[PDB]
């Protein structure tokens, strides 16, 4: 099929997470052609389509997206835009800092932070979850990474990380906030990398700050100071971005009350299932872009070298073919469900060691479970009159108020 509208980029901004899905459903097809982001695109959805999108013999990520994404969200010429052995090499760096051990450690640091926070929340009237999550996440991320952070900087660093995240799919003021935060963050971290390399800053083998500063490329040389900084930021920023998910989890509890008790009469088993469903059900990652690097045919389409393609993350997560009642929050659906690498792709598909799939997925899940645990067992609270509406057009999305909690008491 071929949408020939000449304003599809504009429509993409108005429809956001539903742009691809509205059409694939309209054309009764898992693929369609369109002119987007100033390029000739093929948009696809579904697990099968995801499997092809991740075939690295047919797709490359270099030059696949407008540079505006690199100048806000990613950092210029970083891991997201690399291909081949070089990508895999650097990808191994990231992965080595996200193994189960680091995961466990980050969950641990979060559990401690939430416990301590109870003391202050009990004394406050209201608390904005998003705001509290960003700061705790930024505190933990930096400590675990060995990145010095003075209490006076916390808010400012956390705020800068979110501005980058919030600018990825925006135009205007929202996008500019990201353009201005990235250089502040980069210089801040670049100076640390350099201090570390001169031995003027204590670093610990095994920590992100350390590994990024001393990492060696396939050619034996260290990354440039700027790049090492950009890459450490691609570790820190995303951890702080977990705040969006933490908030959707609280939203889920509030909008679907039964699960609060469901969790309570439950184990970690049920927390896992709830967290899985939060990531599948709520919008965060919209779609991924790549370029056809060698002609091929799939599902009766001809992908020609040089063509841009968008893989629909959100739509796929809501595909009835693999998810019964896909538009409803039901962590029960995960009841001993077999793990699959493409039926659900909120953080990418395939294998993280064989593609660009998110290497921080385990960390995301463990931090989400630890945080969920806190909301369900460590405190009691009310959810006052507020705007909890989240947009499917706005990218990224977040319950409007940031999720205000009041009357907080230790349980
Ligand atoms: C807050 C929730 C998160 C979401 C929704 C998310 C989503 C994604 C998506 C969709 C991709 C692209 C996959 C592809 O290109 O095929 C990605 C890449 C990545 N994420 Fe996550 N991510 C999250 C958290 C994290 C965390 C906590 C870390 C750090 C520990 C992290 C580190 C990365 C890195 C380094 C990449 C790029 C890897 C590559 O290109 O090979 N992410 N993420
Ligand atoms: C014109 C809009 C283009 C949008 C491009 C979409 C890029 C994919 C986004 C991945 C979202 C990642 C979620 C936040 C994690 C992070 O901080 O990296």
Swiss-Prot record:
Heme binds at residue 358. It is an enzyme of class 1 (oxidoreductase). Its EC number is 1.11.2.4. Disulfide bonds: none annotated. GO terms for molecular function: heme binding; iron ion binding; monooxygenase activity; oxidoreductase activity, acting on paired donors, with incorporation or reduction of molecular oxygen. InterPro entries: Cyt_P450, Cyt_P450_E_grp-I, Cyt_P450_sf, Cytochrome_P450_3A. Keywords: Heme, Iron, Metal-binding, Monooxygenase, Oxidoreductase. It catalyses: a 1,2-saturated fatty acid + H2O2 = a 2-hydroxy fatty acid + H2O; a 2,3-saturated fatty acid + H2O2 = a 3-hydroxy fatty acid + H2O; tetradecanoate + H2O2 = (3R)-hydroxytetradecanoate + H2O; tetradecanoate + H2O2 = (2R)-hydroxytetradecanoate + H2O. Its cofactor is heme. It comes from the Bacteria. It holds the Pfam family p450. The keyword Transport does not apply. Gene3D superfamilies: Cytochrome P450. Belongs to the cytochrome P450 family. Catalyzes the alpha- and beta-hydroxylation of myristic acid in the presence of hydrogen peroxide. PANTHER family: CYTOCHROME P450 FAMILY 3, FATTY-ACID PEROXYGENASE. This is Fatty-acid peroxygenase. It comes from Bacillus subtilis (strain 168).
